[PDB]
Design a protein around this ligand. Structure first.
Ligand SMILES: O=P(O)(O)O[C@H]1[C@H](OP(=O)(O)O)[C@@H](OP(=O)(O)O)[C@H](OP(=O)(O)O)[C@@H](OP(=O)(O)O)[C@H]1OP(=O)(O)O
Ligand SMILES: Nc1ncnc2c1ncn2[C@@H]1O[C@H](COP(=O)(O)OP(=O)(O)NP(=O)(O)O)[C@@H](O)[C@H]1O
Ligand SMILES: [Mg+2]
Ligand SMILES: [Mg+2]
Ligand SMILES: [Mg+2]
Ligand SMILES: [Mg+2]
Length: 325
């Protein structure tokens, strides 16, 4: 009798190259069998018909029925790698920043503008040419405006008059671009937003990817904040720059992983003013195009499974040593 690790996510994720790379490696564990739940089953079958597993790796993305995943876990009580209830909170940037603050994690100064869709003018916003006031809090340009929905990637940056004004509108990458300049200088007038101070960086973002609290891979990418042209190598994959996290940042990774209860967790750092600020926590995310990450991630996940479940399966297990990479 094998320990069964169930993978429960949308097909776009379950059949992604990084997923296939990691699952083939987890399958190399002698006592582990991987079962990938079919999307048609996830969407159309009641949770009572879903396959059994002892350990569940499951995560929300666009179109995923999180309610069903939660009901399945309640029904079968598997060992859960990425907590499902926290994935509701991960979808809401206000909840994300609230958790970060509670954990003493540095983040941009921010304020929430909650807008009544039937009374859009009644909200706590005053606008000047070079600043906004949100619930009385002043944000001088440059500042950042994010939809409260973490799944809405239409994040806008507003430039000061001294820089020519206008705004940068970011979006999910469409081919060669991830943002574009707009002459519009005034903030959006419908929707709820987080406003935050613009953190000055060297023009890159640090993307961090945890596999449990003691392993995190980091890499840097050009920020879409000022120029929206995507940098590509001769093979057409986005250019990445090497990063090694300092001691403070490794602690940040440890805190984020545990606070959100997401063993596999992507989050973003802005290296600004000699500190590192978290500006986004995405939850489940694999590194792409690193063979070493595929090896390390599968080994760690397999080891977590074996550590937790070998005793009840009466399987001998000695806990091995793992890199922090
Ligand atoms: O949220 P991120 O960690 O920054 O990674 C995203 C995410 O992929 P993952 O779910 O596998 O982490 C996107 O998926 P969604 O959030 O949109 O569901 C995907 O966007 P696609 O929908 O277009 O697949 C996008 O990849 P893309 O480069 O094609 O925009 C990719 O970011 P990266 O691959 O650049 O790291
Ligand atoms: N406060 C800030 N100061 C400076 N740059 C910022 C700030 N907030 C976000 N940015 C830039 O805007 C980009 C997108 O913001 P982010 O909060 O990551 O949006 P998202 O829509 O969640 N992106 P994704 O990583 O795909 O989930 C970041 O990667 C930074 O380059
Ligand atoms: Mg096996
Ligand atoms: Mg996601
Ligand atoms: Mg981000
Ligand atoms: Mg995000």
């Amino acid at each position: 009798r094998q320990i069964v690790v169930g993978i429960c996510s949308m097909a776009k994720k379950s059949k992604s190259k990084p997923m296939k790379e990691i699952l083939e490696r987890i399958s190399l564990f002698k006592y582990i069998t991987v079962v990938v739940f079919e999307e048609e089953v996830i969407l159309n079958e009641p949770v009572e018909n879903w396959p059994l597993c002892d350990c569940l790796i499951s995560f929300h993305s666009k179109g995923f029925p999180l309610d069903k995943a939660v009901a399945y876990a309640k029904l079968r009580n598997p060992f859960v790698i990425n907590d499902l209830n926290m994935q509701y909170l991960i979808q809401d940037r206000r909840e994300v920043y609230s958790i970060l603050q509670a954990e003493g994690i540095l983040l941009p100064r921010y304020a929430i503008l909650n807008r009544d869709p039937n009374n859009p003018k009644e909200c706590n916003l005053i606008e000047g040419e070079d600043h906004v006031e949100v619930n009385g809090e002043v944000f001088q340009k440059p500042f950042v405006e994010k939809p409260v929905s973490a799944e809405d990637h239409n994040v806008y940056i507003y430039y000061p008059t001294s820089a020519g004004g206008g705004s940068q509108r970011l979006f999910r990458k469409i081919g060669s671009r991830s943002s574009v300049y707009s002459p519009e200088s005034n903030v959006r007038k419908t929707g709820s937003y987080i406003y935050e101070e613009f953190m000055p960086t060297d023009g890159t973002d640090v993307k961090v990817y945890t596999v449990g609290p003691d392993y995190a891979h980091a890499e840097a990418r050009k920020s879409p904040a000022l120029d929206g042209k995507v940098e590509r190598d001769s093979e057409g994959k986005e250019v990445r720059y090497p990063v090694i996290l300092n001691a403070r940042e490794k602690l940040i990774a440890w805190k984020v992983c545990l606070a959100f209860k997401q063993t596999v967790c992507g989050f973003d750092l802005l290296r600004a003013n000699g500190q590192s600020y978290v500006c986004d926590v995405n939850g489940f995310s694999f590194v792409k195009n690193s063979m070493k990450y595929y090896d390390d991630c599968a080994k760690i996940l397999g080891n977590i499974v074996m550590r937790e479940l070998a005793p009840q399966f009466h399987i001998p297990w000695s806990i091995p040593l793992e890199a922090e990479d």
